[PDB]
Design a binder for this molecule. Structure first.
Ligand SMILES: OC[C@H]1O[C@H](O[C@H]2[C@H](O)[C@@H](O)[C@@H](O)O[C@@H]2CO)[C@H](O)[C@@H](O)[C@@H]1O
Length: 404
């Protein structure tokens, strides 16, 4: 019979790819369908380029793709419209904001699988040791805490110890970190939903200069090459007070044998001042049936399975990844494992989106401009004021003649 082939999450990021292959195998065993799992690179932008090779070729060699929240506007021609396959009631079981995101010119491109939001991870043992009772609410507090704890831990002999790790590599993860910096300083959304390119302002420039100030001081010099996992590995070894990352890091840090098991909490990222908005960049992944799949019915069945209550439950409980079904946030087992899902649900609901809706199919070009200009501030090549001016100009060229 058919072999249903899935290009799914990466085995290079935590347990995601191992787990996803397990889920696909479980579906194949349940239904008596042969399956194959095709692995992917760690970084989202590398995955997009890989999958574009298959799409350009109209390739039947992958049936189901796991796609980023920022992709529907790019990938829609390559997606089978799922709308006819779901009842209205079935679709309403997902958060409507994500279903809207996944719907392009009426085409339901993909089902919501897991959501994501940037959060602050903090070592609670170390805050207590150094006389702090709460995690930082402002970026200045984060810097002050990081300086004090670093000084102490270095003096105590840990030469590997840093105050803060984050994603500073030039890739899509930096666009996520940078949107959080800019929005949390009152600097806007880089490109507003209305199309206004707003990033050339003093608040956005300040946010970027602040981030530069961390590099080689409270964050490692090498943070300019860090993606999710490079940040996570410094943190997980016990060598960072703070980390910015996504929810998946939580289950991994609690695993038996983790040096930091039981020693951390999570909270919203800090902001410049009490009247700035909280920033948590919206992330998350969706499930797309290929327009080029020879087996649409089987592929849809697999996608509905992976997006189901019990598979999302398993993702929440085992991998601390955020469901796209509101019902799961009241499930007793989800909440007993991850109590912080309730504490931060409003942070996740208020997450700030990258400008993928307004940039549509040009989003990847926009994002490459963002991360390259931000990276130039981090590396010290440019100051934030010049970088936001230069980024404004770049994005203006990219979006010229694009209407949404
Ligand atoms: O790097 C930006 C990218 O980060 C997140 O995707 C991670 C995800 O959290 C992991 O659990 C895993 O699946 O790998 C992903 C790719 O690194 C966001 O979900 C995604 O929206 C964002 O673009």
């Amino acid at each position: 019979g058919p072999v249903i082939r899935v290009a799914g999450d990466s085995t290079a990021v935590g347990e995601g790819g191992r787990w996803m292959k397990e889920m696909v195998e479980a579906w194949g065993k349940k239904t008596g369908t042969r399956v194959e799992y095709i692995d992917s690179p760690a970084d989202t932008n590398d995955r997009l380029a890989l999958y574009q090779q298959y799409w350009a070729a109209r390739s039947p060699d992958v049936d189901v793709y796991m796609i980023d929240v920022i992709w529907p506007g790019i990938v829609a021609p390559h997606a089978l419209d799922l709308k006819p396959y779901l009842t209205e009631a079935e679709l309403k079981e997902f958060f409507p904001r994500i279903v809207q995101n996944n719907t392009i010119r009426g085409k339901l491109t993909s089902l919501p699988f897991f959501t994501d939001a940037g959060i602050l991870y903090y070592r609670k043992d170390l805050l207590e040791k150094y006389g702090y009772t709460s995690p930082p609410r402002t970026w200045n507090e984060l810097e002050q805490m990081a300086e004090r704890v670093m000084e102490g831990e270095r003096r105590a002999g840990n030469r590997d110890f840093w105050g803060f790790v984050f994603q500073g590599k030039p890739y899509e993860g930096l666009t996520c970190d940078a949107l959080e910096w800019i929005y949390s300083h009152g600097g806007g959304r880089i490109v507003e939903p209305d199309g206004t390119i707003s990033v050339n302002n003093g608040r956005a420039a300040l946010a970027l200069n602040r981030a530069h100030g961390w590099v080689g001081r409270i964050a490692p010099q090498g943070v300019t090459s860090y993606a999710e996992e490079e940040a996570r590995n410094v943190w997980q070894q016990g060598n960072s007070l703070f980390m910015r990352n996504w929810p998946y890091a939580y289950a991994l840090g609690q695993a038996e044998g983790s040096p930091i098991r039981g020693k951390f909490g999570v909270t919203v990222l800090p902001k410049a001042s009490a009247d700035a908005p909280n920033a948590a960049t919206l992330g998350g992944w969706q499930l797309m049936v290929s327009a080029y799949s020879r087996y649409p019915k089987e592929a849809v069945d697999l996608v509905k399975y992976l997006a189901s209550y019990e598979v999302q439950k398993d993702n929440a409980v085992r991998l601390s990844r955020l469901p796209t079904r509101p019902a799961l946030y009241t499930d007793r087992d989800v909440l007993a494992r991850n109590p912080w899902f309730r504490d931060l649900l409003p942070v996740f609901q208020n997450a700030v989106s990258r400008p993928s809706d307004v940039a549509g199919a040009r989003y990847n070009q926009v994002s490459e401009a963002i991360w390259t200009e931000v990276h130039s501030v981090l590396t010290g090549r440019k100051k934030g004021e010049q970088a936001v001016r230069d980024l404004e100009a770049r994005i203006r060229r990219i979006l010229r003649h694009h209407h949404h």
